[PDB]
């Protein structure tokens, strides 16, 4: 990457004070998925685990994120993909403490997973960044705009990026790391 060394230095400093938590969606994030690239690149970043990944169940994802937060010593940034991003949203909306910010990458339309009754179209109590594709099967761009506006999130148009997964080339996704660095630095307690 053109900006790799500067990305890594900046993110290494952010990590001295904030903890990144990776939240995958359905089936987990495979080895070539950006969340997995990022985990290998930043081995101190955290990642949720659970026994079953193949059934969308909001409460299981929420329970996994809660488990993860219970042992965090610093404020967390939740970095979600698809169903994982919905879970990140729901946990913040239900009033979970210890969250500095959330990054929602290709959040799914709640109806696709029959959780339209659990995700509110209302502001998230913390700073939020949302990345939306124009050819994501689970979320139209105009609906991404609707949700971002409702959630009071910044909306980052990544073009035709499919579902923002390995099959689409994400992948190392240095641009996501760059944006994360920008966003997270303003959340650091002592900068
Ligand atoms: Ca973990
Ligand atoms: Ca229904
Ligand atoms: Cl998903």
PDB file of N, CA and C and ligand atoms in Angstrom, residues 46-49 68, ligand 1:
ATOM      1  N   UNK A  46      -9.177  -7.350  18.971  1.00  0.00           N
ATOM      2  CA  UNK A  46     -10.015  -8.426  19.478  1.00  0.00           C
ATOM      3  C   UNK A  46     -11.068  -8.823  18.463  1.00  0.00           C
ATOM      4  N   UNK A  47     -11.684  -9.974  18.688  1.00  0.00           N
ATOM      5  CA  UNK A  47     -12.647 -10.536  17.751  1.00  0.00           C
ATOM      6  C   UNK A  47     -13.616 -11.434  18.478  1.00  0.00           C
ATOM      7  N   UNK A  48     -14.901 -11.338  18.135  1.00  0.00           N
ATOM      8  CA  UNK A  48     -15.897 -12.113  18.877  1.00  0.00           C
ATOM      9  C   UNK A  48     -15.805 -13.542  18.385  1.00  0.00           C
ATOM     10  N   UNK A  49     -16.162 -14.469  19.258  1.00  0.00           N
ATOM     11  CA  UNK A  49     -16.251 -15.878  18.935  1.00  0.00           C
ATOM     12  C   UNK A  49     -17.614 -16.435  19.355  1.00  0.00           C
ATOM     13  N   UNK A  68     -17.395 -10.292  25.073  1.00  0.00           N
ATOM     14  CA  UNK A  68     -16.182  -9.665  24.644  1.00  0.00           C
ATOM     15  C   UNK A  68     -15.898  -8.375  25.401  1.00  0.00           C
TER      16      UNK A  68
HETATM   17 CA1  LIG B   1     -12.524 -12.637  21.668  1.00  0.00          CA
END
